[PDB]
């Protein structure tokens, strides 16, 4: 993610939607917080058990915190178990489908 | 779209994001209103020129109206010029990427 981004909100109490000028990202809130905790604690079991789970509503402030920290992780791509932290769609795929330039 | 859906908001002042249990839809606000106006007026030039354009902010109420009407169109799929009204992503593609069942 570029430094300039827009948080669109939570989906299914599971993903944080955030976009920059290139992609829309669907960030798994559990995998992100597990990665945040794992880089601090260096213990994957502890990081997992203390992190938020899917199905929990998050406040706007909590969402802001997580996304800000995400950009500074050493590994913002995969959790300690190797699962992708996010799904991404290039914005151009959305624009081109409806016949718009991007 | 199924009758039960969740509007997630506007993106880039261009798309309305709305999901049901199967897909997340990115609905082009101009193409949707052009389709609404075209089915009423039966004039594609008039329908186009009176419809909202990309880049206009829409109120929550206006967004609700458009999405409610979208589901009742005779052709909710393509505008009178044949451009797809929306892009869609199966929710399972997002969930499966992060290792979740859906
Ligand atoms: Mn441990
Ligand atoms: Mn875990
Ligand atoms: Mn675990
Ligand atoms: Mn803050
Ligand atoms: Mn993990
Ligand atoms: Mn493409
Ligand atoms: Mn005319
Ligand atoms: Mn038009
Ligand atoms: Mn036109
Ligand atoms: Mn209303
Ligand atoms: Mn058209
Ligand atoms: Mn698939």
Numbering used by the authors:
A (entry chain A), B (entry chain A): 0, 325 to 425
Sentences from the paper on this structure:
MutLs, with a few exceptions, are endonucleases that incise the error-containing (i.e., newly synthesized) strand of the mismatched duplex. Prokaryotic MutL endonucleases and the endonuclease subunits of eukaryotic MutL homologs include two domains: the N-terminal ATPase domain and the C-terminal endonuclease domain (CTD). The dimerization subdomain contains the metal-binding sites, in which multiple zinc ions are coordinated by the residues from highly conserved motifs: DQHAX2EX4E, ACR, and CPHGRP (underlined residues coordinate the zinc ions). Here, we solved the crystal structure of the endonuclease domain of Aquifex aeolicus MutL in the manganese- or cadmium-bound form, revealing that these metals compete with zinc at the same sites.
In order to explore this possibility, we performed crystal structure analysis of the aqMutL CTD complexed with manganese ions. The aqMutL CTD, which is purified as the zinc-bound form, was incubated with the buffer solution containing 2 mM manganese ion at 70°C for 24 h. The protein was concentrated and crystallized in the presence of a 50 mM manganese ion. The crystal structure was solved with manganese single-wavelength anomalous dispersion phasing. Peaks of electron density in the anomalous diffraction map calculated from data collected at a wavelength of 1.8900 Å were clearly observed at the M1, M2, and M3 sites of the aqMutL CTD at 100% occupancy. The overall structure of the manganese-bound form was almost identical to that of the zinc-bound form; the root-mean-square deviation between the two structures was 0.1 Å. No peak of electron density in the anomalous diffraction map was observed around Asp351 of the DQHAX2EX4E motif. Thus, it was confirmed that manganese ions bind to the same sites of aqMutL as zinc ions. The electron density of the guanidino group of Arg406 was also missing in the manganese-bound form of the aqMutL CTD. Likewise, the position of the α4 helix, the structure of Arg406, and the quaternary structure of the manganese-bound form were the same as those in the zinc-bound form (respectively).
